[PDB]
Amino acid sequence: QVYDYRAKRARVVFGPELVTLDPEEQFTVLSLSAGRPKRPHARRALCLL
Amino acid sequence: PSGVEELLNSAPRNKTRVVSYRVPHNAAVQVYDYRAKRARVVFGPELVTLDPEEQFTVLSLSAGRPKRPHARRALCLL
Amino acid sequence: QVYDYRAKRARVVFGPELVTLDPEEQFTVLSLSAGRPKRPHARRALCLLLGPDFFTDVITIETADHARLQLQLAYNWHFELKNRNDPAEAAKLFSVPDFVGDACKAIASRVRGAVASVTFDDFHKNSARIIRMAVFGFEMS
Amino acid sequence: LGPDFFTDVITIETADHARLQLQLAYNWHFELKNRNDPAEAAKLFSVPDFVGDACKAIASRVRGAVASVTFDDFHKNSARIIRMAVFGFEMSLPKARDQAVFPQNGLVVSSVDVQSVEPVDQRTRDALQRSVQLAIEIT
Amino acid sequence: LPKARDQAVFPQNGLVVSSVDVQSVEPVDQRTRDALQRSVQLAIEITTNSQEAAAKHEAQRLEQEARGRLERQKILDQSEAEKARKELLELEAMSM
Amino acid sequence: TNSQEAAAKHEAQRLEQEARGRLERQKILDQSEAEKARKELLELEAMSM
């Protein structure tokens, strides 16, 4: 998902479609719990599964 | 009021350039206008754009590894 | 709050509005009880807080079994306001030389007067109840 | 004139000859039935030293309270007797009124907080320490 | 008899004394202070003897009531055991 | 000091007296209900014997 500061509007997308941002649009980066077992901040990624 | 580094998160910002701050979708923020004598609140995917007399409502948080009354102060309440 | 020597008149203000003094006007500076635990004169400030918050405090107390023990207390607190348009009640808000130190001290003496009767055993097995009921309030049930 | 608390501490002797110091917050303020009267205001300053006279008179009253009371009941219940016996009368014998007043200058003491009653004799503290040490083990 | 009036007065010059506060009554003899010190030192320990006597009487009474309960349960269990023993005596009687 | 000690002594002695008297009466009582259950046990034992 990405939020547009210019349109003041978020938009979400998934599946086999590449994103193409407007200049004010920004990715919704997401922290993940990774590490060998678990860890509150590790392998941060915007690509939620 | 030393709120600079929180919203910069190298080269110093152009202070003449308007201050602005992207607001994370679940995040919430508020700013008070000294000129209009009026506070205003905003949240979600909308960047802030202050009037010159407007000031951020900075908020102390309880951070640290466990808990601590003054740590990781931030205006971006979740 | 600030007092005007020229108009011979005090005025109070709060919330998101910057102060702008007349030349004879002076701030009502207020001493506070700060320090790591409590201290009658520390972090003096004119910016009194009305909002909800918690006191940072710890209190030694003697039990009936002559076993002294320290204990910290969060002390949730706020300043209730039946009105905001009244200069007088606002003057009452600042009329106290030190609301927080007086609060923590009076509550401390009340805790001492609570534990002074209570045994160490029942206190250790049930502090949270008696520590609250005995220092303020009366029957509710 | 505003509400505040005295900074004071008082040694006192119990009936068991066990002297002990204790601090007292002494909540206080100056009541004013009027402000337009020069005379009452003159009464406010008529006292050479309102605070020292207050703390001293209250101190002697505390001494006159503890002088009869035993150390045991005092240690187990200081906050009540320390207040009732130095000012006020029956209100319900009955526990004394929380208010206290000095007519000579219009002073009015409020409730007196307590937080410490430690004995002057450290050996006595060792005795109570051994006593509570007996208490935990009998429990 | 009745407690004296708090007021005091000197007619010779019109003086008027009020109430007299007290805060200290310490003996001139420090040895006497040592004596009272040993006295209150006796007081705290006899009070410890008092609380110990209280806890002792209480724990003793509780152990008494408890052993009485367990005793009654013993007599009861002996009763049902007497029942099953009686049935066993019946079968043993017919068998013998 | 001998006087106060005599007072505390007489008092603690009287309290221990009243206490042991209470516990004694409770003993006789418990012996009574134990006598009851013992009586029932004597009945079952009687029929069994």
Physical arrangement of strands within the biggest beta sheet of chain A? 2-1-3
Count of helices of chain A? 0
Structural class by helix and strand composition of chain A: mainly beta
What is the subunit organization of this protein?
A: part of a larger assembly
Q: Count the strands of chain A?
A: 3
Distance between the termini of chain A: 12 Å
Largest beta-sheet characterization of chain A: 3 strands, antiparallel
Subcellular location (chain E): Cytoplasm; Nucleus
Protein name (chain E): Major vault protein
Cross-link (Glycyl lysine isopeptide (Lys-Gly) (interchain with G-Cter in SUMO2)) (chain E): 86
Can you lay out the helices and strands and say which pair or pack?
This is part of a larger assembly, with 6 copies of chain A.
Chain A: E1 2-4, E2 9-11, E3 25-27
Antiparallel strand pairs in A: 1-2, 1-3
